[PDB]
Design a protein around this ligand. Structure first.
Ligand SMILES: CCCCCCCCc1ccc(O[C@H]2O[C@H](COS(=O)(=O)O)[C@@H](O)[C@H](O)[C@H]2O)cc1
Ligand SMILES: [Mg+2]
Length: 246
Protein backbone atom coordinates (compact mmCIF):
# COMPACT_ATOMS: atom_id res chain seq x y z
CA UNK A 1 0.00 0.00 0.00
CA UNK A 2 2.94 2.33 0.61
CA UNK A 3 3.74 4.42 -2.47
CA UNK A 4 7.28 4.61 -3.88
CA UNK A 5 8.77 7.95 -2.87
CA UNK A 6 10.13 9.69 -5.96
CA UNK A 7 9.73 13.44 -5.35
CA UNK A 8 12.25 15.33 -3.25
CA UNK A 9 10.88 18.27 -1.24
CA UNK A 10 12.28 21.70 -1.97
CA UNK A 11 15.19 22.82 0.18
CA UNK A 12 13.26 25.80 1.57
CA UNK A 13 9.89 24.17 2.23
CA UNK A 14 8.10 24.19 5.60
CA UNK A 15 9.14 20.70 6.71
CA UNK A 16 10.44 19.36 10.02
CA UNK A 17 12.72 16.37 9.42
CA UNK A 18 13.07 13.28 11.62
CA UNK A 19 15.53 10.56 10.62
CA UNK A 20 16.14 7.13 12.01
CA UNK A 21 19.78 6.08 12.02
CA UNK A 22 20.42 2.34 11.66
CA UNK A 23 18.94 1.06 8.42
CA UNK A 24 17.95 4.56 7.30
CA UNK A 25 20.90 6.96 7.24
CA UNK A 26 23.54 4.22 7.59
CA UNK A 27 23.76 0.80 5.99
CA UNK A 28 23.10 -2.26 8.14
CA UNK A 29 26.27 -3.89 9.49
CA UNK A 30 26.95 -7.27 11.14
CA UNK A 31 28.09 -5.35 14.25
CA UNK A 32 26.80 -1.95 15.45
CA UNK A 33 30.33 -0.57 15.95
CA UNK A 34 31.05 -0.97 12.23
CA UNK A 35 28.11 1.29 11.35
CA UNK A 36 29.09 4.60 9.75
CA UNK A 37 27.23 7.56 8.29
CA UNK A 38 29.38 8.89 5.42
CA UNK A 39 30.63 12.43 5.99
CA UNK A 40 28.95 13.48 2.73
CA UNK A 41 25.56 12.46 4.15
CA UNK A 42 26.18 14.26 7.45
CA UNK A 43 26.92 17.45 5.49
CA UNK A 44 23.67 17.05 3.54
CA UNK A 45 21.74 16.63 6.79
CA UNK A 46 23.43 19.69 8.31
CA UNK A 47 22.70 21.77 5.20
CA UNK A 48 19.11 20.50 5.15
CA UNK A 49 18.68 21.47 8.81
CA UNK A 50 20.24 24.88 8.17
CA UNK A 51 17.69 25.75 5.47
CA UNK A 52 14.81 24.60 7.70
CA UNK A 53 15.46 26.70 10.83
CA UNK A 54 17.29 23.79 12.45
CA UNK A 55 14.17 21.57 12.39
CA UNK A 56 15.99 18.28 11.90
CA UNK A 57 16.37 15.54 14.51
CA UNK A 58 17.76 12.01 14.75
CA UNK A 59 15.24 9.55 16.25
CA UNK A 60 17.05 6.33 17.14
CA UNK A 61 17.06 3.38 19.49
CA UNK A 62 20.77 3.97 20.09
CA UNK A 63 21.96 5.88 23.13
CA UNK A 64 22.41 9.64 22.81
CA UNK A 65 26.20 9.39 23.12
CA UNK A 66 26.43 6.81 20.32
CA UNK A 67 24.45 9.14 18.05
CA UNK A 68 26.87 12.00 18.76
CA UNK A 69 29.77 9.72 17.82
CA UNK A 70 28.07 8.69 14.58
CA UNK A 71 27.14 12.28 13.70
CA UNK A 72 30.51 13.83 14.60
CA UNK A 73 31.35 16.64 14.16
CA UNK A 74 27.70 17.68 13.88
CA UNK A 75 25.38 17.97 16.88
CA UNK A 76 21.68 17.60 15.99
CA UNK A 77 18.58 17.46 18.17
CA UNK A 78 18.27 13.83 19.19
CA UNK A 79 15.94 11.17 20.48
CA UNK A 80 17.82 8.19 21.87
CA UNK A 81 16.66 4.88 23.35
CA UNK A 82 13.39 5.17 21.38
CA UNK A 83 12.63 8.47 23.15
CA UNK A 84 13.80 7.67 26.69
CA UNK A 85 16.66 10.11 25.98
CA UNK A 86 16.10 13.40 24.16
CA UNK A 87 18.05 16.58 23.38
CA UNK A 88 16.08 19.61 22.19
CA UNK A 89 17.25 22.52 20.03
CA UNK A 90 18.53 24.27 23.19
CA UNK A 91 20.90 21.36 23.88
CA UNK A 92 18.76 20.52 26.92
CA UNK A 93 18.60 16.78 27.59
CA UNK A 94 15.64 14.86 29.04
CA UNK A 95 16.17 11.39 30.52
CA UNK A 96 13.53 8.87 31.53
CA UNK A 97 14.58 7.43 34.89
CA UNK A 98 13.81 3.91 36.13
CA UNK A 99 13.94 2.84 39.79
CA UNK A 100 17.49 1.79 40.60
CA UNK A 101 16.26 -1.53 41.99
CA UNK A 102 14.49 -2.33 38.71
CA UNK A 103 17.61 -1.71 36.62
CA UNK A 104 19.75 -3.83 38.96
CA UNK A 105 17.31 -6.74 39.31
CA UNK A 106 16.52 -6.93 35.58
CA UNK A 107 20.16 -6.75 34.46
CA UNK A 108 21.12 -9.49 36.92
CA UNK A 109 18.20 -11.56 35.61
CA UNK A 110 19.07 -11.12 31.92
CA UNK A 111 22.80 -11.73 32.45
CA UNK A 112 22.27 -15.11 34.14
CA UNK A 113 20.28 -16.41 31.15
CA UNK A 114 23.04 -15.67 28.61
CA UNK A 115 24.98 -18.84 29.45
CA UNK A 116 22.07 -20.77 27.89
CA UNK A 117 21.77 -18.35 24.93
CA UNK A 118 25.30 -18.24 23.49
CA UNK A 119 25.84 -15.66 20.78
CA UNK A 120 23.32 -13.26 22.32
CA UNK A 121 24.62 -9.89 23.55
CA UNK A 122 23.00 -7.90 26.36
CA UNK A 123 23.39 -4.14 25.89
CA UNK A 124 22.65 -2.08 29.00
CA UNK A 125 21.46 1.44 28.22
CA UNK A 126 20.80 2.87 31.70
CA UNK A 127 17.01 2.87 31.38
CA UNK A 128 16.67 0.08 28.80
CA UNK A 129 18.08 -3.31 27.82
CA UNK A 130 18.74 -4.58 24.30
CA UNK A 131 19.19 -8.29 23.51
CA UNK A 132 21.14 -8.63 20.26
CA UNK A 133 20.98 -12.03 18.55
CA UNK A 134 22.18 -11.44 14.98
CA UNK A 135 24.93 -14.05 15.43
CA UNK A 136 22.37 -16.62 16.68
CA UNK A 137 18.91 -16.19 15.14
CA UNK A 138 17.75 -19.40 16.84
CA UNK A 139 17.53 -17.62 20.22
CA UNK A 140 14.90 -15.14 19.00
CA UNK A 141 11.84 -16.99 20.30
CA UNK A 142 13.48 -17.51 23.69
CA UNK A 143 14.57 -13.87 24.02
CA UNK A 144 11.03 -12.74 23.15
CA UNK A 145 9.43 -14.97 25.79
CA UNK A 146 12.09 -13.92 28.32
CA UNK A 147 11.70 -10.18 27.73
CA UNK A 148 7.92 -10.53 27.63
CA UNK A 149 8.07 -12.12 31.07
CA UNK A 150 10.39 -9.36 32.30
CA UNK A 151 7.75 -6.79 31.37
CA UNK A 152 5.08 -8.73 33.29
CA UNK A 153 7.06 -8.91 36.55
CA UNK A 154 8.32 -5.31 36.18
CA UNK A 155 5.31 -3.38 34.81
CA UNK A 156 7.46 -0.23 34.50
CA UNK A 157 8.99 -1.87 31.40
CA UNK A 158 7.68 -2.42 27.88
CA UNK A 159 8.66 -4.64 24.97
CA UNK A 160 10.23 -3.27 21.77
CA UNK A 161 10.90 -5.83 19.06
CA UNK A 162 13.33 -5.03 16.28
CA UNK A 163 15.63 -6.33 13.58
CA UNK A 164 17.80 -8.99 15.28
CA UNK A 165 17.14 -7.26 18.63
CA UNK A 166 14.66 -7.71 21.46
CA UNK A 167 14.60 -4.52 23.52
CA UNK A 168 13.20 -3.77 26.99
CA UNK A 169 12.34 -0.09 27.43
CA UNK A 170 10.50 2.15 29.89
CA UNK A 171 6.74 1.86 29.54
CA UNK A 172 5.30 4.79 27.62
CA UNK A 173 8.50 5.34 25.60
CA UNK A 174 8.24 5.20 21.82
CA UNK A 175 9.34 7.16 18.78
CA UNK A 176 5.84 8.56 18.32
CA UNK A 177 5.96 10.41 21.64
CA UNK A 178 9.55 11.41 20.85
CA UNK A 179 8.37 13.03 17.62
CA UNK A 180 5.44 14.55 19.53
CA UNK A 181 7.76 16.17 22.08
CA UNK A 182 9.70 17.79 19.24
CA UNK A 183 6.62 18.95 17.31
CA UNK A 184 5.47 21.22 20.17
CA UNK A 185 8.90 22.91 20.50
CA UNK A 186 10.00 26.13 18.75
CA UNK A 187 11.90 25.05 15.60
CA UNK A 188 9.75 22.03 14.72
CA UNK A 189 6.40 23.53 15.75
CA UNK A 190 4.48 24.98 12.83
CA UNK A 191 6.21 22.76 10.25
CA UNK A 192 5.05 19.59 8.51
CA UNK A 193 6.72 16.49 10.01
CA UNK A 194 8.70 14.13 7.78
CA UNK A 195 9.87 10.87 9.36
CA UNK A 196 12.07 8.26 7.67
CA UNK A 197 12.59 4.90 9.38
CA UNK A 198 12.93 1.18 8.74
CA UNK A 199 12.04 -0.94 11.82
CA UNK A 200 9.09 -1.74 14.08
CA UNK A 201 10.04 1.04 16.51
CA UNK A 202 9.61 3.50 13.63
CA UNK A 203 6.00 2.42 13.03
CA UNK A 204 4.95 4.39 16.12
CA UNK A 205 6.48 7.47 14.54
CA UNK A 206 4.79 6.70 11.22
CA UNK A 207 1.44 6.66 13.02
CA UNK A 208 1.75 10.10 14.61
CA UNK A 209 3.24 11.60 11.43
CA UNK A 210 0.34 10.25 9.35
CA UNK A 211 -2.22 11.62 11.81
CA UNK A 212 -0.42 15.00 11.66
CA UNK A 213 -0.74 15.18 7.87
CA UNK A 214 3.01 14.69 7.47
CA UNK A 215 5.16 12.46 5.30
CA UNK A 216 6.08 8.99 6.59
CA UNK A 217 8.73 7.04 4.66
CA UNK A 218 9.49 3.35 5.18
CA UNK A 219 12.98 2.14 4.21
CA UNK A 220 13.40 -1.39 2.92
CA UNK A 221 11.05 -4.33 2.72
CA UNK A 222 8.20 -5.33 5.02
CA UNK A 223 4.65 -4.31 5.87
CA UNK A 224 4.43 -0.70 6.98
CA UNK A 225 2.06 2.02 8.12
CA UNK A 226 4.11 4.62 6.23
CA UNK A 227 2.49 6.28 3.23
CA UNK A 228 5.76 6.24 1.27
CA UNK A 229 8.64 3.84 0.78
CA UNK A 230 12.31 3.97 -0.17
CA UNK A 231 13.96 0.74 -1.24
CA UNK A 232 17.35 0.99 0.49
CA UNK A 233 19.71 3.19 2.49
CA UNK A 234 21.47 4.48 -0.69
CA UNK A 235 18.01 5.55 -1.86
CA UNK A 236 17.72 7.65 1.31
CA UNK A 237 21.09 9.20 0.41
CA UNK A 238 19.97 9.97 -3.15
CA UNK A 239 16.69 11.41 -1.90
CA UNK A 240 18.70 13.49 0.57
CA UNK A 241 21.03 14.69 -2.19
CA UNK A 242 18.14 15.71 -4.46
CA UNK A 243 16.59 17.88 -1.74
CA UNK A 244 19.90 19.70 -1.31
CA UNK A 245 20.79 19.93 -5.02
CA UNK A 246 17.93 19.46 -7.53
C1 LIG B 1 25.95 -9.57 8.00
C2 LIG B 1 24.58 -9.39 7.34
C3 LIG B 1 23.90 -8.15 7.89
C4 LIG B 1 22.75 -8.55 8.82
C5 LIG B 1 22.76 -7.59 10.00
C6 LIG B 1 21.41 -7.53 10.71
C7 LIG B 1 21.56 -6.70 11.98
C8 LIG B 1 20.50 -5.60 12.03
C9 LIG B 1 20.66 -4.76 13.30
C10 LIG B 1 21.11 -5.34 14.48
C11 LIG B 1 21.26 -4.57 15.63
C12 LIG B 1 20.97 -3.21 15.62
O1 LIG B 1 21.12 -2.47 16.81
C13 LIG B 1 21.73 -1.22 16.68
O2 LIG B 1 20.81 -0.29 16.18
C14 LIG B 1 19.62 -0.35 16.94
C15 LIG B 1 18.50 0.43 16.25
O3 LIG B 1 18.87 1.77 16.09
S1 LIG B 1 17.87 2.66 15.11
O4 LIG B 1 17.58 1.81 13.72
O5 LIG B 1 18.57 4.11 14.72
O6 LIG B 1 16.41 2.92 15.87
C16 LIG B 1 19.88 0.21 18.33
O7 LIG B 1 18.70 0.17 19.08
C17 LIG B 1 20.97 -0.63 19.00
O8 LIG B 1 21.35 -0.05 20.22
C18 LIG B 1 22.18 -0.71 18.06
O9 LIG B 1 23.16 -1.53 18.64
C19 LIG B 1 20.52 -2.63 14.43
C20 LIG B 1 20.36 -3.40 13.29
MG1 LIG C 1 15.31 1.81 13.20
Amino acid sequence: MAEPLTVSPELTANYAYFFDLDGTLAEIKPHPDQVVVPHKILQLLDRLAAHNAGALALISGRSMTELDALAKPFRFPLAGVHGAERRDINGKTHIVRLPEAVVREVEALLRSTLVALPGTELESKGMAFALHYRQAPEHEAALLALAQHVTQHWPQLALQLGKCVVEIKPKGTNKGEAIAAFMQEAPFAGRIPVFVGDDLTDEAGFGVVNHAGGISVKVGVGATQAAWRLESVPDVWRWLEQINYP
